[PDB]
Point group: D2
Chain length 121, copies 4
């Protein structure tokens, strides 16, 4: 899917390189400008490969576990959102960042936020 | 013992997953509710070297709700942690985004929480 | 029977509330966890004329975590529904925002879920 | 609290009129540009009345139950966020909109989003 496939940046300055496969797969790498992260992390996700054509966005999501060969934050983020195509393509998301915690600290395990991605073009 | 296996949440949904050695999650999801029938592909990631202090194992995965039977034009992500032991559990929060027009984007995303165990419902 | 009363969540926190006839919630909250001691003021709102089809009663409330003992420079909102019957329940999701610099705003907000009943813990 | 007290608008065109009391109270009215809503609804909430002075925002939250003398959507929204003062004051929030549902439909009871409010000045 040519629309989604490419390089994207968000408002924090983070980098999202993704390829959208014909089967609904998302694969790529993520580099965060913030947090307990350095270098590229694997991402995987899914997207609606046959979206509505009535002006609606294309639903998608992906996950990064924050372990690579250089860093392990013991955490994972999922982004859930929609791709909005056109000449000024955007991916608008909300996300959940869960850190591994003890059971007593589980109440404070999950951060929530929102990222807007702009396609480099 | 481990993430790999067949899990069920409080709604009776079935989450079948394999955890690869280096952090991949791959499997299928069947929801007991919503605009869904049969199994859907899921992929995700988990921390393949968790802390050794009693902490849970962070993980997440995604389902896009399109298969041979239906297309809900939506996707859910689950973010959470696996907690091992005698009754292993995955505790999650989730975000279900539907494709919308820009005008309706404000009402595009449902949020909830699912807890999974390996105990089959009756 | 009703929203008015003393409630306890799964953490052992104590939520004491009065539901006014026209939709006000007023009371106190004591958290079993976090940067908190003793009771904090809370205020909120509820649907004072719910649907008559078996649906729950929508409600929400806020605590700012400042009292005579501490100030965590944070606030939590709970959004959910009251479900009456033999074991009345309030099921919520919550957002805990801490005051941060603009640079740290990305990590300002925790999310979770609390379920309340009138059963005192032991 | 002069900072928070005033009229605010968000990116949807909704209107938030609030008064911040010395005791940490927020009181006012909300008018939504969208959804099952018409006219003004009561809001109540709380804010940190003695915030940090190290450059941090002021934590706050409020609730609207979507019943007034003209409309009842059988729902309630809470906004949780922070006030960022200065000449271009903002209230940056995330929100949870819970609708009353049957028990079988409770899984789909709650919407999540984010609103940014600008002070009318
Ligand atoms: O601190 C960690 O646990 C790992 C890094 C998390 C970075 C977060 C931050 N970076 C970003 O591009 N968007 C937000 C949501 S991602 O969880
Ligand atoms: O209706 C749809 O858009 C597709 C099905 C969504 C089912 C949801 C529901 N099922 C489940 O096991 N947990 C929750 C979160 S999943 O988004
Ligand atoms: O640490 C703080 O900032 C203040 C205390 C927060 C306690 C939280 C925790 N306690 C509870 O009963 N439910 C959850 C959500 S409330 O934000
Ligand atoms: O549809 C309803 O149930 C009542 C109206 C909800 C309006 C929502 C929408 N309007 C707004 O200014 N911000 C968002 C979050 S508020 O729940």
């Amino acid at each position: 899917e040519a629309g989604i496939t490419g390089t994207w940046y968000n408002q924090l300055g983070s980098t999202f390189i993704v390829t959208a496969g014909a089967d609904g797969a998302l694969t790529g790498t993520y580099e965060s400008a913030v947090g307990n992260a350095e270098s590229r992390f694997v991402l995987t996700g899914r997207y609606d490969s046959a979206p509505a054509t009535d002006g609606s966005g294309t639903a998608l999501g992906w996950t990064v576990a924050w372990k690579n060969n250089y860093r392990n934050a013991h955490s994972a983020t999922t982004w859930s959102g929609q791709y909005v195509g056109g000449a000024e393509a955007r991916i608008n998301t909300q996300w959940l960042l869960t850190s591994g915690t003890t059971e007593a600290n589980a109440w404070k395990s999950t951060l929530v936020g929102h990222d807007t991605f702009t396609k480099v073009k």
